[PDB]
Amino acid sequence: METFAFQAEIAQLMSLIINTFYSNKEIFLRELISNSSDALDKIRYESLTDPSKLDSGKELHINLIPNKQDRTLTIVDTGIGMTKADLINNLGTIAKSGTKAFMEALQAGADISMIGQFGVGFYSAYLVAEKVTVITKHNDDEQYAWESSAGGSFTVRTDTGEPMGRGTKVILHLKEDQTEYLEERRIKEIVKKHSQFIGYPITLFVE
């Protein structure tokens, strides 16, 4: 396990998302499904030039998996996935410019719900999660686990868990007062409201 320090801008945004009072927390699911959708679009488009890019799996889908016992909501997609370079370096650059733009837009009067327009919608996960684990597999790299409970650091390690083939699994370790996001009726309500037109099958698993 390797430990990394978040740069100042993202660290400040993560603290804002965790601290600030905001009742409309359900938007996290739309943002994570949007990232999954974007990742799926990416592998699909690349497969048009190189069909062997789907040898790691032809299915293009999104699964929502609540687990009341573990107090986790897991989002699984078979998108392009992220390499080690993406997790540590590339997305760190994106986190900085996206945070700066978002903070500038907020200061003018923009709302937290507009986060995805700045490319940092992933961070809305901290509205409901005390810890986020990202297990990802890109065709050009090994399976990795990125994780952060905020507090200024994140970890990256090669993942030894169940092989994913290709894609990303985001495990949301929910805050104690955010268990409504494990209820079938609640998840169904959110997907219908914000993600009804996503171009991939969204399967809501039940327990």
Ligand X SMILES: Cc1onc(-c2ccc(O)cc2O)c1-c1ccccc1
**Contacting positions for ligand X (CB under 6 A):** 32, 35-36, 38-39, 42, 77, 79-82, 122, 168, 170
Residue 206 CB, nearest approach to ligand YJX (Å):
26
96 is in an annotated binding site: yes
Is residue 152 a contact residue for ligand YJX (CB under 6 A)? no
Q: Which is nearer to ligand X, 66 or 79 (CB)?
A: 79
Rounded Cα gap, residues 189 and 193, in angstroms: 6
Chain length of the chain: 207
- Smallest gap from Cβ 6 to ligand YJX, in A, equals 5
**Closest listed residue to residue 39, CA positions, set 86, 97, 72:** 86
Question: In whole angstroms, how close is the CB of 89 to ligand X at the nearest point?
Answer: 13
- Give CA–CA dist 19/27, Å, rounded: 17
87 near ligand YJX, judged by CB under 6 A: yes
CA quadruple 33, 38, 40, 43: dihedral, nearest 10: -160
CA–CA gap between residue 79 and residue 125 (Å, rounded):
19
Closest residue (Cβ) to ligand YJX? 92
How many CA within 13 A on the CB side of residue 83? 7
Part of the chain binding ligand YJX (CB under 6 A), chosen from 48-56, 71-79, 115-123, 192-200 = 115-123
Q: Is 13 in the site for ligand YJX (CB under 6 A)?
A: no
Among 28, 29, 35, 124, binds ligand YJX (CB under 6 A): 35
Q: What share of the chain is helix, strand, coil (3-state, %, to 5)?
A: 45, 25, 30
Tell me if 67 is assigned to a ligand binding site. Answer: no
Cα–Cα distance, 119 to 57 (Å, whole number)? 27
The token pair at 32 is 């994570």
Judged by CB under 6 A, which of 13, 75, 95, 191 binds ligand YJX? 95
Question: Annotated binding residues for ATP, as ranges?
Answer: 35, 77, 96, 122
List of residues contacting ligand YJX (CB under 6 A): 6, 10, 35, 87-88, 91-92, 94-95, 98, 119-120, 122, 134, 146
